[PDB]
Amino acid sequence: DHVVLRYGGTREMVPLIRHEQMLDMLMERARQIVQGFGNLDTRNMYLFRHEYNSPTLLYPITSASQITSGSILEIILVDRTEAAVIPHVVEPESYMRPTFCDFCGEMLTGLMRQGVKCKNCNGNFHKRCSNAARNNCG
Amino acid sequence: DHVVLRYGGTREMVPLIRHEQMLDMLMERARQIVQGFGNLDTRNMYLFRHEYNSPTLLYPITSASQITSGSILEIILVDRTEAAVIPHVVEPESYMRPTFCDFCGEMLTGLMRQGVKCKNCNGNFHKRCSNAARNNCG
Ligand SMILES: [Zn+2]
Ligand SMILES: [Zn+2]
Ligand SMILES: [Zn+2]
Ligand SMILES: [Zn+2]
16 A cells, blocks of 8 residues: 655555554655755745546645555655656567566556556556656656 | 735735635636746645735645735745845935836835835835745846
């Protein structure tokens, strides 16, 4: 029973308890992830989840209740200068050993053509995942 | 009875009605401001207000009620690659003709030293304003 945090180009699993300070704790993991990149100021750090069935859309998390198990939460420093997205350019791909979707962390499933592969950063994603918000090609 | 919208390096006044679709309308002005910069996609556009007495902090707007008259709302495309802030480097300044705070739009008041002036972008701000979130030096 997890959630996934994402920042920079890094994902991390965090066990999802239902408990009053669940959100406090996710936030401090988030803060720790970002200082993992380098003392970036953190006062306007927010988590945004991807919408059910529509991963191009983000919703800000305000109460612990909006966190549902399995959700992908984005760590976003909202005070910080906007810059152009870098999208994966992607085409279908069949996989012969079990491989995981580089964005969401769950397994590509199916017989053939289990996901898409990006030509420039070589990642492996579900089609629904290859263009999720904040899945930038680094 | 206004609010201020900000995007890019531009501020705009919008009359604040209390009415069910007040937020709908601010959002579509916001969208129009951003396409003023160039067909940037807009599905993850959010407004954030600056906190009372603490302009370095932003809070996302979710219901029309969080909008209070006079507030400075930031227009933020949250799906979009983070980038380092560019802060004003600023020192006090006395003003001899009435001049407005370039960030918030209200007048510098006082007798001497009514605000601060930035050496590189030459702007005029209240001290509380010279380092508000998203008041980047362009
Ligand atoms: Zn890629
Ligand atoms: Zn996936
Ligand atoms: Zn400046
Ligand atoms: Zn001001």
